[PDB]
Design an enzyme around this catalytic site. Structure first.
Site, short mmCIF file in Angstrom:
data_model
loop_
_atom_site.label_atom_id
_atom_site.label_comp_id
_atom_site.label_asym_id
_atom_site.label_seq_id
_atom_site.Cartn_x
_atom_site.Cartn_y
_atom_site.Cartn_z
N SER A 18 0.77 -1.36 -0.17
CA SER A 18 0.04 0.06 0.08
C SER A 18 0.72 1.47 0.20
CB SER A 18 -1.05 0.10 1.26
OG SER A 18 -0.45 0.35 2.39
N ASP A 36 -4.14 7.29 11.01
CA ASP A 36 -3.07 6.45 10.28
C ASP A 36 -1.84 7.26 10.43
OD1 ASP A 36 -1.69 5.54 8.00
OD2 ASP A 36 -3.57 4.81 7.20
N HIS A 53 0.34 5.90 5.98
CA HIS A 53 -0.06 6.43 4.64
C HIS A 53 0.41 7.88 4.67
CE1 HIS A 53 -1.82 2.35 4.56
NE2 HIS A 53 -1.24 2.54 3.56
#
Ligand SMILES: *[C@@H]1O[C@H](CO)[C@@H](O[C@@H]2O[C@H](CO)[C@@H](O)[C@H](O)[C@H]2NC(C)=O)[C@H](O)[C@H]1NC(C)=O
Ligand SMILES: *[C@@H]1O[C@H](CO)[C@@H](O)[C@H](O)[C@H]1NC(C)=O
Ligand SMILES: *[C@@H]1O[C@H](CO)[C@@H](O)[C@H](O)[C@H]1NC(C)=O
Ligand SMILES: *[C@@H]1O[C@H](CO)[C@@H](O)[C@H](O)[C@H]1NC(C)=O
Ligand SMILES: *[C@@H]1O[C@H](CO)[C@@H](O)[C@H](O)[C@H]1NC(C)=O
Ligand SMILES: *[C@@H]1O[C@H](CO)[C@@H](O)[C@H](O)[C@H]1NC(C)=O
Ligand SMILES: [Ca+2]
Ligand SMILES: [Co+2]
Ligand SMILES: [Co+2]
EC number: 2.3.1.-
Length: 354
Positions: A84, A330, A333
């Protein structure tokens, strides 16, 4: 455009504030950005994180011109392969090239593991292939929901590699899913034979096994004259604010400026044993691989994560959720525009240099 000397180390330098050139695009200008990474739309209000450029010690990065890149991409395929974070880097590259491509002359198509962004006039593609461990694993479907027990087959890469052949620019990575557990779960036989038994292998030993399978695949299958191969080093996390001497912070969520004090030694938990394995294996191959050494420079960017300004199981975190970053931030990311645009300025520099 001013190309750096071949010998300039692009990855040693410092972050410089420059709101005249960065960000290289605005969030709203890029209709392809997914909801995970559109931080401003998702409620973030500070935007100084967008204005930082990375200045190598001995040279400048050449001014980004998407047209020059697209000319190097004419009739060619660029594919990001991995996890990712490589998908985050792919989204950035898509924005970077699409910035000069007119409406209707571009499109995105996702078919299973493969995402394809096309630039019609150049017959150019910027692609993402989901292979979070590179080798065959039980987690190779990007739309499968979370499982606790990820398992890999460290000597199996042929089935993935079929998708990588003929590509002109290949950018591999793999890190974040190595970090969930102390050791790695390694299948004894093969998924396709219904085998289920696994043993637990020390993280760097299993990593080296994976990198050796990958390297061998590369050596067998890549023509250096057709294909340029890159390997993106570990993207760091910022989950503990004490790590950069801010015990009063909340993970990465209160951070709106980079770490600027170059005499403050710090760690944010990156497993540099894997960094060494990747650095060695990539320099050891017959096929040249350009090692994108993005780790330490990314470690300074405590400010550039999505935090709470993102999605969760497909929908935007609510105001109630966003108000509790300790639970919902998060710190893996990255907002776009932001840090992965820099990762891509290194790719651009190398591509226009040949
Ligand atoms: C990866 O990049 C880091 C810097 O971002 C490199 O570490 C620096 O290396 C220079 C020598 O070239 C030293 O003077 C610096 O003190 C180091 N800086 C920091 C902040 O650690 C590292 O050498 C690079 N590694 C590889 C293998 O390319
Ligand atoms: C750029 O940043 C400076 C200092 O933070 C600010 O004063 C300026 O208004 C910004 N950009 C411009 C004028 O384009
Ligand atoms: C368009 O690009 C692909 C990707 O490399 C290439 O194989 C194909 O032959 C190109 N088509 C034409 C007509 O140039
Ligand atoms: C995407 O590519 C696939 C190839 O599997 C093709 O079948 C499909 O028509 C394409 N989708 C769109 C929306 O163009
Ligand atoms: C930079 O960090 C060092 C080591 O912690 C410290 O001695 C110094 O005060 C810092 N400089 C600043 C914040 O200007
Ligand atoms: C591999 O990595 C470490 C540190 O990056 C180095 O000291 C060691 O000598 C290297 N080994 C090989 C076989 O390259
Ligand atoms: Ca010139
Ligand atoms: Co300076
Ligand atoms: Co081709």
């Amino acid at each position: 455009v001013e190309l750096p000397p071949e010998e300039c180390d692009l990855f040693t330098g410092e972050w410089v504030f420059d709101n005249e050139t960065h960000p290289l695009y605005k969030e709203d200008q890029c209709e392809f950005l997914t909801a995970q990474v559109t931080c401003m739309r998702n409620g973030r209000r500070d935007s100084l994180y967008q204005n930082w450029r990375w200045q190598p010690r001995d040279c400048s990065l050449p001014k980004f011109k998407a047209k020059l890149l697209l000319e190097k991409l004419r009739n060619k395929r660029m594919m990001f392969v991995g996890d990712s974070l490589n998908r985050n880097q792919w989204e950035s590259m898509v924005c970077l090239v699409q910035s000069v491509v007119p409406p209707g002359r571009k499109s995105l198509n996702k078919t299973g593991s493969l995402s394809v962004f096309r630039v019609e006039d150049y017959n150019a593609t910027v692609e993402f292939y989901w292979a979070p461990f590179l080798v065959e694993s039980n987690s190779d479907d990007p739309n499968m929901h979370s499982i606790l027990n990820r398992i890999i087959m460290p000597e199996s890469i042929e089935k993935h590699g079929v998708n990588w052949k003929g590509v002109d620019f290949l950018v591999f990575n793999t890190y974040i899913w190595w970090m969930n557990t102390f050791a790695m779960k390694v299948l004894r036989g093969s998924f396709d034979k219904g085998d289920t038994e696994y043993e637990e292998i020390e993280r760097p030993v299993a990593y080296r096994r994976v990198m050796r399978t990958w390297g061998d695949w590369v050596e067998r299958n890549i023509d250096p004259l057709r294909t340029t191969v890159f390997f993106a080093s570990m993207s760091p996390l910022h989950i503990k604010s004490l790590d950069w001497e801010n015990p009063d912070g909340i993970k990465c969520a209160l951070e709106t400026t980079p770490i600027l004090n170059m005499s403050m030694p710090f760690s944010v938990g990156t497993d540099y044993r894997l960094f060494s394995v990747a650095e060695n294996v990539t320099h050891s191959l017959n096929v040249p691989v350009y090692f994108l050494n993005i780790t330490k420079l990314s470690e300074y960017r405590k400010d550039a994560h999505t935090s709470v300004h993102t999605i969760r199981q497909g929908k935007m975190l609510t105001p109630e959720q966003q108000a509790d970053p300790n639970t919902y931030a998060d710190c893996i990311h990255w907002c776009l525009p932001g840090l992965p645009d820099t990762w891509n300025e290194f790719l651009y520099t190398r591509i226009i240099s040949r």
